[PDB]
Short mmCIF file of C-alpha atoms in Angstrom, two decimals:
data_model
loop_
_atom_site.label_atom_id
_atom_site.label_comp_id
_atom_site.label_asym_id
_atom_site.label_seq_id
_atom_site.Cartn_x
_atom_site.Cartn_y
_atom_site.Cartn_z
CA UNK A 1 42.64 67.62 17.86
CA UNK A 2 45.37 69.04 16.76
CA UNK A 3 45.04 68.18 13.17
CA UNK A 4 41.75 69.98 13.37
CA UNK A 5 43.48 73.47 14.49
CA UNK A 6 45.44 73.27 12.35
CA UNK A 7 43.32 72.92 9.14
CA UNK A 8 40.80 75.99 10.51
CA UNK A 9 44.68 77.80 11.17
CA UNK A 10 45.17 77.28 7.19
CA UNK A 11 41.75 78.30 6.06
CA UNK A 12 42.08 81.23 8.06
CA UNK A 13 45.46 82.50 6.00
CA UNK A 14 44.20 80.52 2.99
CA UNK A 15 43.07 83.67 1.58
CA UNK A 16 45.82 85.70 2.66
CA UNK A 17 48.82 86.22 0.16
CA UNK A 18 51.93 85.85 2.89
CA UNK A 19 50.69 84.10 6.67
CA UNK A 20 52.76 87.07 8.79
CA UNK A 21 55.25 85.97 10.79
CA UNK A 22 53.17 85.17 14.16
CA UNK A 23 51.61 83.11 12.11
CA UNK A 24 54.89 81.26 11.04
CA UNK A 25 56.21 81.24 14.68
CA UNK A 26 52.71 79.09 15.47
CA UNK A 27 52.73 77.03 12.14
CA UNK A 28 56.04 76.19 13.47
CA UNK A 29 55.38 74.87 17.35
CA UNK A 30 52.11 73.55 15.78
CA UNK A 31 54.20 71.40 13.59
CA UNK A 32 56.86 70.37 16.49
CA UNK A 33 54.33 68.85 18.40
CA UNK A 34 53.39 66.99 15.63
CA UNK A 35 56.31 65.94 15.05
CA UNK A 36 57.02 64.34 18.50
CA UNK A 37 53.39 62.95 18.61
CA UNK A 38 53.85 61.11 15.31
CA UNK A 39 57.64 60.16 16.58
CA UNK A 40 55.99 58.37 19.89
CA UNK A 41 53.81 56.64 17.68
CA UNK A 42 56.27 55.09 15.31
CA UNK A 43 57.59 54.20 18.45
CA UNK A 44 54.44 52.71 19.85
CA UNK A 45 54.74 51.10 16.64
CA UNK A 46 57.82 49.71 15.95
CA UNK A 47 59.27 46.78 17.25
CA UNK A 48 56.89 45.70 15.38
CA UNK B 1 30.72 48.23 9.84
CA UNK B 2 29.20 51.01 11.47
CA UNK B 3 27.61 52.89 8.22
CA UNK B 4 28.30 56.51 8.48
CA UNK B 5 26.65 59.31 6.39
CA UNK B 6 28.55 60.95 3.09
CA UNK B 7 27.57 63.61 1.40
CA UNK B 8 25.77 63.57 -1.25
CA UNK B 9 23.47 60.78 -0.42
CA UNK B 10 19.88 61.03 0.27
CA UNK B 11 18.80 61.88 3.42
CA UNK B 12 14.97 62.89 4.78
CA UNK B 13 14.94 64.25 9.36
CA UNK B 14 12.89 62.49 11.09
CA UNK B 15 11.26 63.98 14.86
CA UNK B 16 9.27 62.83 17.07
CA UNK B 17 6.78 64.01 19.38
CA UNK B 18 4.54 62.39 22.10
CA UNK B 19 0.20 63.03 21.46
CA UNK B 20 -2.74 61.37 23.46
CA UNK B 21 0.60 59.24 24.49
CA UNK B 22 1.48 58.09 21.63
CA UNK B 23 4.36 58.48 20.03
CA UNK B 24 4.86 59.95 16.27
CA UNK B 25 7.78 60.19 13.63
CA UNK B 26 7.45 63.24 11.12
CA UNK B 27 9.37 64.48 8.51
CA UNK B 28 10.52 67.51 7.27
CA UNK B 29 9.40 67.78 4.39
CA UNK B 30 8.65 70.77 1.73
CA UNK B 31 6.70 71.49 -2.04
CA UNK B 32 9.15 74.11 -2.78
CA UNK B 33 7.36 75.78 -6.20
CA UNK B 34 3.59 77.53 -4.45
CA UNK B 35 4.96 76.39 -1.12
CA UNK B 36 8.51 77.27 0.41
CA UNK B 37 7.69 76.83 3.72
CA UNK B 38 8.88 73.94 5.66
CA UNK B 39 6.19 71.53 7.02
CA UNK B 40 5.80 68.19 9.42
CA UNK B 41 4.08 65.40 7.40
CA UNK B 42 3.05 61.81 9.96
CA UNK B 43 5.20 58.52 8.84
CA UNK B 44 4.67 56.51 11.79
CA UNK B 45 0.74 55.28 10.47
CA UNK B 46 2.45 54.83 6.80
CA UNK B 47 0.79 50.55 6.20
CA UNK B 48 -2.31 52.69 6.76
CA UNK B 49 -1.60 56.26 4.88
CA UNK B 50 1.34 56.31 2.93
CA UNK B 51 3.29 59.58 3.01
CA UNK B 52 5.02 61.98 0.22
CA UNK B 53 8.77 61.12 0.91
CA UNK B 54 9.23 62.51 -2.27
CA UNK B 55 9.08 65.81 -1.19
CA UNK B 56 10.04 65.00 2.01
CA UNK B 57 13.61 63.68 1.14
CA UNK B 58 16.93 66.03 1.05
CA UNK B 59 20.51 65.04 -0.01
CA UNK B 60 23.48 66.51 1.49
CA UNK B 61 25.45 68.64 -1.35
CA UNK B 62 28.45 70.17 1.18
CA UNK B 63 29.89 68.97 4.78
CA UNK B 64 32.28 71.80 5.89
CA UNK B 65 34.51 73.57 8.58
CA UNK B 66 33.62 76.87 10.11
CA UNK B 67 36.24 77.92 8.76
CA UNK B 68 35.72 76.86 5.51
CA UNK B 69 32.48 77.78 5.16
CA UNK B 70 33.57 81.79 5.65
CA UNK B 71 36.36 81.17 3.09
CA UNK B 72 33.65 80.11 0.37
CA UNK B 73 30.88 82.46 1.83
CA UNK B 74 33.77 85.72 0.98
CA UNK B 75 34.68 84.25 -1.97
CA UNK B 76 32.11 61.97 -0.98
CA UNK B 77 32.64 63.12 1.87
CA UNK B 78 31.62 61.45 5.94
CA UNK B 79 30.06 63.73 7.34
CA UNK B 80 31.21 65.28 11.50
CA UNK B 81 29.58 66.83 14.37
CA UNK B 82 30.83 70.80 14.31
CA UNK B 83 30.38 71.19 10.23
CA UNK B 84 28.29 72.94 8.40
CA UNK B 85 25.42 71.01 5.76
CA UNK B 86 24.13 71.81 2.77
CA UNK B 87 20.99 70.44 1.81
CA UNK B 88 18.62 70.43 -1.34
CA UNK B 89 15.36 69.33 -1.77
CA UNK B 90 15.21 66.21 -4.26
CA UNK B 91 11.89 67.46 -5.76
CA UNK B 92 12.69 71.57 -6.27
CA UNK B 93 15.76 72.15 -6.19
CA UNK B 94 15.69 74.17 -3.82
CA UNK B 95 17.91 74.74 -0.44
CA UNK B 96 16.23 74.68 3.36
CA UNK B 97 17.03 77.84 4.83
CA UNK B 98 15.63 80.11 7.77
CA UNK B 99 13.90 82.53 6.35
CA UNK B 100 13.73 85.94 8.27
CA UNK B 101 10.41 86.27 7.96
CA UNK B 102 7.85 84.15 11.01
CA UNK B 103 4.81 84.04 11.33
CA UNK B 104 4.40 82.63 15.27
CA UNK B 105 2.49 84.42 17.41
CA UNK B 106 3.12 82.12 19.83
CA UNK B 107 7.49 82.71 19.95
CA UNK B 108 8.21 86.59 19.16
CA UNK B 109 11.68 85.19 18.38
CA UNK B 110 11.58 82.08 16.32
CA UNK B 111 12.04 82.42 12.15
CA UNK B 112 9.97 79.93 9.70
CA UNK B 113 12.06 77.32 8.09
CA UNK B 114 11.58 77.05 4.63
CA UNK B 115 13.15 76.51 1.15
CA UNK B 116 15.30 78.76 -0.58
CA UNK B 117 15.94 79.17 -4.53
CA UNK B 118 19.98 79.48 -4.45
CA UNK B 119 22.31 78.59 -2.61
CA UNK B 120 24.79 81.57 -1.68
CA UNK B 121 24.59 83.41 2.07
CA UNK B 122 24.71 82.18 5.20
CA UNK B 123 21.06 81.19 5.86
CA UNK B 124 21.03 78.04 3.49
CA UNK B 125 23.41 76.32 6.46
CA UNK B 126 22.97 74.27 9.64
CA UNK B 127 25.55 72.84 12.33
CA UNK B 128 24.93 70.06 12.87
CA UNK B 129 26.33 68.63 17.85
CA UNK B 130 25.68 65.71 19.10
CA UNK B 131 22.13 65.22 21.78
CA UNK B 132 23.31 63.07 23.65
CA UNK B 133 27.31 63.95 26.03
CA UNK B 134 29.00 60.75 24.25
CA UNK B 135 29.38 61.85 21.52
CA UNK B 136 32.10 64.09 21.00
CA UNK B 137 32.62 67.05 18.37
CA UNK B 138 34.96 65.96 15.30
CA UNK B 139 33.54 62.06 15.67
CA UNK B 140 31.72 60.20 12.03
CA UNK B 141 28.13 60.87 12.02
CA UNK B 142 26.36 58.39 11.99
CA UNK B 143 23.60 56.49 11.46
CA UNK B 144 21.13 56.80 13.43
CA UNK B 145 22.26 59.36 15.64
CA UNK B 146 20.06 62.33 16.97
CA UNK B 147 21.42 65.42 16.77
CA UNK B 148 20.59 69.07 16.74
CA UNK B 149 20.89 71.34 14.16
CA UNK B 150 21.81 75.06 14.90
CA UNK B 151 21.62 77.52 11.76
CA UNK B 152 24.59 79.88 11.14
CA UNK B 153 22.58 82.87 9.80
CA UNK B 154 20.30 82.80 12.71
CA UNK B 155 21.95 81.06 16.31
CA UNK B 156 18.60 79.24 16.37
CA UNK B 157 18.09 75.55 16.72
CA UNK B 158 15.63 73.47 13.73
CA UNK B 159 12.80 73.12 16.26
CA UNK B 160 9.60 71.31 16.89
CA UNK B 161 6.65 73.39 18.00
CA UNK B 162 4.14 72.17 20.28
CA UNK B 163 2.91 75.25 21.34
CA UNK B 164 -0.50 75.54 19.14
CA UNK B 165 -2.83 72.71 18.13
CA UNK B 166 -1.04 72.01 15.16
CA UNK B 167 2.00 71.05 15.06
CA UNK B 168 5.18 73.19 13.17
CA UNK B 169 8.00 73.77 12.25
CA UNK B 170 10.84 76.24 13.27
CA UNK B 171 13.72 78.02 13.98
CA UNK B 172 14.37 78.74 17.91
CA UNK B 173 16.10 78.89 20.77
CA UNK B 174 14.85 75.78 22.12
CA UNK B 175 16.62 72.85 20.66
CA UNK B 176 14.82 69.67 19.19
CA UNK B 177 16.39 66.48 18.36
CA UNK B 178 16.47 65.47 15.03
CA UNK B 179 16.80 61.70 13.09
CA UNK B 180 18.66 62.36 9.92
CA UNK B 181 17.29 59.22 8.48
CA UNK B 182 19.29 57.91 5.10
CA UNK B 183 17.06 56.47 2.20
CA UNK B 184 19.77 56.52 -0.69
CA UNK B 185 24.00 56.02 -0.44
CA UNK B 186 25.55 55.16 -4.10
CA UNK B 187 23.03 53.54 -6.86
CA UNK B 188 25.25 51.25 -8.78
CA UNK B 189 24.11 52.34 -13.46
CA UNK B 190 20.99 49.74 -14.52
CA UNK B 191 20.06 48.51 -11.42
CA UNK B 192 16.15 50.00 -10.30
CA UNK B 193 15.75 51.62 -7.24
CA UNK B 194 13.53 52.39 -5.03
CA UNK B 195 11.37 55.79 -4.90
CA UNK B 196 11.88 56.58 -8.76
CA UNK B 197 9.21 57.95 -10.95
CA UNK B 198 9.61 55.49 -13.92
CA UNK B 199 7.41 54.43 -16.47
CA UNK B 200 5.92 50.34 -17.49
CA UNK B 201 6.23 49.20 -21.03
CA UNK B 202 3.66 45.68 -22.00
CA UNK B 203 6.15 44.82 -24.51
CA UNK B 204 9.26 45.50 -26.13
CA UNK B 205 8.45 49.43 -25.48
CA UNK B 206 4.49 49.77 -27.37
CA UNK B 207 1.95 49.87 -25.05
CA UNK B 208 2.72 51.20 -21.32
CA UNK B 209 0.54 51.17 -17.88
CA UNK B 210 -1.89 54.90 -17.93
CA UNK B 211 -5.06 55.80 -15.25
CA UNK B 212 -7.64 57.48 -18.55
CA UNK B 213 -7.04 61.05 -18.96
CA UNK B 214 -8.02 64.58 -17.49
CA UNK B 215 -12.14 64.66 -17.28
CA UNK B 216 -13.01 61.05 -18.25
CA UNK B 217 -15.30 59.35 -17.89
CA UNK B 218 -14.67 56.72 -15.02
CA UNK B 219 -12.90 59.01 -13.04
CA UNK B 220 -9.29 58.16 -13.73
CA UNK B 221 -9.28 55.67 -11.03
CA UNK C 1 12.99 97.86 35.20
CA UNK C 2 17.13 98.33 35.88
CA UNK C 3 17.67 94.47 35.43
CA UNK C 4 16.23 95.18 30.98
CA UNK C 5 17.77 98.96 31.09
CA UNK C 6 21.20 97.37 31.89
CA UNK C 7 20.35 94.12 30.10
CA UNK C 8 19.28 96.98 26.74
CA UNK C 9 22.83 98.28 27.91
CA UNK C 10 25.17 95.54 27.31
CA UNK C 11 22.86 94.71 23.71
CA UNK C 12 23.42 97.86 22.69
CA UNK C 13 27.27 97.78 23.58
CA UNK C 14 27.46 94.06 21.91
CA UNK C 15 26.26 96.20 18.89
CA UNK C 16 29.24 95.33 16.10
CA UNK C 17 30.40 99.22 14.95
CA UNK C 18 29.70 101.48 11.58
CA UNK C 19 32.51 100.54 9.86
CA UNK C 20 32.38 96.93 10.36
CA UNK C 21 28.62 97.88 9.45
CA UNK C 22 30.34 99.50 6.50
CA UNK C 23 32.57 97.18 5.39
CA UNK C 24 29.71 94.65 5.78
CA UNK C 25 31.08 91.77 7.66
CA UNK C 26 29.04 88.52 8.08
CA UNK C 27 29.39 88.30 11.79
CA UNK C 28 28.67 91.79 12.68
CA UNK C 29 25.91 91.69 10.23
CA UNK C 30 24.58 88.34 12.41
CA UNK C 31 25.09 90.27 15.88
CA UNK C 32 23.01 93.62 14.47
CA UNK C 33 20.14 91.42 13.30
CA UNK C 34 20.16 88.75 16.52
CA UNK C 35 19.94 91.71 18.62
CA UNK C 36 17.38 93.24 16.75
CA UNK C 37 14.96 90.27 16.37
CA UNK C 38 15.42 90.18 19.90
CA UNK C 39 14.36 93.91 20.69
CA UNK C 40 11.89 94.77 18.27
CA UNK C 41 12.00 99.21 17.70
CA UNK C 42 8.67 99.35 18.83
CA UNK C 43 9.08 98.51 22.02
CA UNK C 44 12.02 100.80 22.41
CA UNK C 45 9.89 104.35 21.20
CA UNK C 46 7.16 102.87 24.01
CA UNK C 47 9.76 102.52 27.04
CA UNK C 48 11.03 106.68 25.80
CA UNK C 49 7.92 107.89 25.59
CA UNK D 1 18.87 92.40 41.47
CA UNK D 2 21.84 89.99 40.88
CA UNK D 3 20.83 89.79 36.74
CA UNK D 4 21.93 93.27 37.46
CA UNK D 5 25.63 93.18 38.67
CA UNK D 6 26.42 90.79 36.70
CA UNK D 7 25.13 92.49 33.50
CA UNK D 8 26.97 95.30 34.39
CA UNK D 9 29.80 93.60 34.77
CA UNK D 10 29.00 91.69 31.15
CA UNK D 11 29.07 95.62 29.96
CA UNK D 12 32.08 97.44 31.88
CA UNK D 13 34.35 93.80 29.84
CA UNK D 14 32.37 94.03 26.49
CA UNK D 15 32.30 97.92 25.57
CA UNK D 16 35.55 99.77 26.23
CA UNK D 17 37.23 103.22 26.31
CA UNK D 18 33.24 104.75 23.90
CA UNK D 19 34.46 101.23 21.79
CA UNK D 20 32.82 97.65 21.19
CA UNK D 21 34.97 94.72 21.28
CA UNK D 22 33.64 92.77 19.15
CA UNK D 23 35.58 89.08 20.01
CA UNK D 24 33.87 89.35 24.11
CA UNK D 25 30.89 90.90 22.08
CA UNK D 26 29.56 88.16 20.11
CA UNK D 27 30.65 85.17 22.27
CA UNK D 28 28.65 87.28 25.52
CA UNK D 29 25.68 86.88 22.19
CA UNK D 30 25.64 84.01 22.00
CA UNK D 31 25.75 82.89 25.83
CA UNK D 32 22.83 84.21 25.62
CA UNK D 33 20.83 82.35 23.23
CA UNK D 34 22.11 79.26 24.47
CA UNK D 35 20.56 80.61 28.04
CA UNK D 36 18.23 83.36 26.87
CA UNK D 37 16.36 82.34 30.85
CA UNK D 38 18.84 86.15 31.38
CA UNK D 39 17.13 87.70 28.87
CA UNK D 40 14.28 87.05 31.46
CA UNK D 41 10.82 85.99 31.90
CA UNK D 42 10.09 88.89 29.53
CA UNK D 43 11.41 87.71 26.26
CA UNK D 44 10.77 84.65 26.90
CA UNK D 45 10.14 84.24 23.71
CA UNK D 46 6.35 81.11 24.13
CA UNK D 47 4.11 82.73 25.93
CA UNK D 48 6.48 85.81 27.03
CA UNK D 49 5.56 89.18 27.79
CA UNK E 1 35.32 44.11 31.37
CA UNK E 2 35.62 47.59 30.13
CA UNK E 3 35.09 47.08 26.40
CA UNK E 4 32.37 45.11 25.57
CA UNK E 5 28.88 47.15 25.01
CA UNK E 6 25.90 45.40 26.82
CA UNK E 7 22.29 45.88 26.21
CA UNK E 8 20.06 44.57 29.32
CA UNK E 9 17.10 42.64 27.99
CA UNK E 10 14.09 41.62 30.60
CA UNK E 11 13.99 38.29 28.93
CA UNK E 12 10.14 37.39 29.61
CA UNK E 13 9.00 41.01 28.21
CA UNK E 14 11.82 41.65 26.34
CA UNK E 15 11.99 45.36 26.90
CA UNK E 16 15.15 47.00 26.76
CA UNK E 17 16.71 49.20 29.78
CA UNK E 18 16.93 52.36 28.99
CA UNK E 19 16.58 55.89 30.68
CA UNK E 20 13.13 57.44 30.95
CA UNK E 21 14.59 61.33 29.95
CA UNK E 22 13.69 64.29 31.84
CA UNK E 23 10.63 64.62 33.54
CA UNK E 24 9.24 68.78 32.98
CA UNK E 25 11.64 71.58 36.13
CA UNK E 26 14.34 67.79 36.58
CA UNK E 27 15.71 70.07 33.16
CA UNK E 28 15.60 73.21 35.35
CA UNK E 29 16.93 71.47 38.61
CA UNK E 30 19.60 70.19 36.50
CA UNK E 31 19.52 67.14 38.55
CA UNK E 32 22.36 64.09 37.15
CA UNK E 33 19.47 61.66 38.39
CA UNK E 34 17.67 59.68 34.69
CA UNK E 35 15.09 57.68 36.38
CA UNK E 36 15.75 53.62 34.95
CA UNK E 37 12.68 52.63 33.19
CA UNK E 38 12.36 49.53 30.54
CA UNK E 39 11.11 50.31 27.36
CA UNK E 40 10.48 48.13 24.04
CA UNK E 41 12.89 50.47 22.04
CA UNK E 42 15.11 52.75 24.14
CA UNK E 43 17.86 54.81 22.57
CA UNK E 44 21.15 54.35 21.07
CA UNK E 45 22.86 55.64 24.38
CA UNK E 46 21.73 52.45 26.30
CA UNK E 47 24.69 50.53 25.73
CA UNK E 48 26.10 49.54 29.58
CA UNK F 1 30.99 10.96 64.29
CA UNK F 2 27.15 10.13 62.84
CA UNK F 3 28.54 11.34 58.35
CA UNK F 4 26.41 13.00 56.42
CA UNK F 5 26.92 12.82 52.86
CA UNK F 6 28.59 15.69 50.55
CA UNK F 7 28.85 17.57 47.01
CA UNK F 8 31.11 20.02 46.41
CA UNK F 9 29.50 21.50 43.47
CA UNK F 10 32.36 24.05 41.38
CA UNK F 11 31.45 28.10 40.64
CA UNK F 12 34.49 28.35 39.19
CA UNK F 13 38.42 26.80 38.41
CA UNK F 14 40.46 29.17 35.84
CA UNK F 15 39.70 32.73 34.41
CA UNK F 16 41.22 34.54 32.02
CA UNK F 17 41.90 37.64 32.41
CA UNK F 18 38.88 40.42 31.53
CA UNK F 19 35.79 38.19 30.16
CA UNK F 20 33.63 38.82 33.39
CA UNK F 21 32.49 35.68 35.37
CA UNK F 22 29.18 34.78 37.28
CA UNK F 23 29.14 35.64 40.60
CA UNK F 24 31.21 38.95 41.18
CA UNK F 25 30.17 42.53 42.50
CA UNK F 26 30.45 44.93 39.26
CA UNK F 27 29.50 48.64 38.66
CA UNK F 28 27.14 49.31 35.58
CA UNK F 29 28.73 52.73 33.43
CA UNK F 30 25.87 54.46 30.89
CA UNK F 31 28.50 55.48 28.54
CA UNK F 32 32.12 56.33 29.13
CA UNK F 33 32.45 56.46 33.02
CA UNK F 34 30.65 59.92 33.55
CA UNK F 35 27.08 57.24 34.89
CA UNK F 36 26.13 54.92 36.63
CA UNK F 37 23.54 52.21 37.70
CA UNK F 38 22.30 53.70 41.30
CA UNK F 39 19.78 53.12 43.81
CA UNK F 40 18.33 56.45 46.24
CA UNK F 41 20.77 56.97 49.01
CA UNK F 42 19.47 56.08 52.51
CA UNK F 43 16.34 57.89 54.26
CA UNK F 44 15.42 58.26 50.44
CA UNK F 45 11.49 58.49 50.37
CA UNK F 46 11.00 56.72 47.71
CA UNK F 47 12.37 54.20 49.66
CA UNK F 48 15.36 52.92 48.54
CA UNK F 49 13.47 50.67 45.80
#
């Protein structure tokens, strides 16, 4: 779900030359969440 | 291994109707040249009467997210529920579209569905949605799945109209379930496949199977 | 009559603004086309008459 | 009567200070077309005066 | 339990358990009751 | 004090975890647990048939 949201938001900003500050902040929140999710999945599978 | 519809595949759209307490499967069809408007060709009898599939067949050129479609309009992939698809007639090289014109006096809001020469515009695009609750958006479309098709341009469903005695195809706010049935996915070079026009040559290309020319006495039988 | 009048008022208010129309925004054009399909002009003129 | 009540609520929501709010208006139109009973027994489509 | 997808088939007839489909005005009511029938073909969804 | 011969016939010995076994009460769920096979509630007209 998060990936779909990020893809749509990237499409929204695709034509625009430069992302503005609020868009940067929103990307940053999304990527921090995705980072935590990746780490959690990695930790599930690790050991293995 | 559950077959997943993919772009560049060729499909036929089927709908089911109950007439005389007897189920009937009907395929969307368009001649293109001469008549742009779509109609329904029954396929259930099949063995007693062969249907004309060539016009019925469509190919999935593109599947896109709504946002990507918006950007593209401003300027082999698996299908996902909620994406927008572009469908090309195999015979006429035309695009399926929601026409502005309406013929149905029964439903004033409804619009006719027909072929369009150019891919430009929202009309040619359609969005897929699950017919059933268990299916959810973002899920890969599966062969045999019942689907709901909504026009981007008109926000109306591809619909089967039984109000008139004759069965008709229209874009309406009422929804009709549709099944996307594959005909071909990928063909190896050479390697004859069904549904293709070809010539039959008796030997080393000298002579071929044929029927009598026009206005012949045999009546071309 | 009040129900239908209120529905018409809501739809007209939902209708896009002129400057969006002019800019050519596809969503605005789509909304206006939908509203036009829902409500034909002849019916409005008849009610006004 | 109840339809009128809900309709004027949606009016106040969509239209503000002489200008339409497209964000709410487009959604209202989509919802109404999804449920066309809100339009009325008239404007029904099939078999509709 | 909770994993397998099972289709119920009446052995003698060979029919497949499935929902009848809404009768007119049932969709108006929105009732959550769908009568179960034994049918020759059924739907995808029949799995239990 | 009179004796009768009896046969002890097994029904189950050991079951693997999960792995449905016969003779157990269970629920049948059409899809992802939303709805289940059932009959009409008490004092229904259908006579719970």
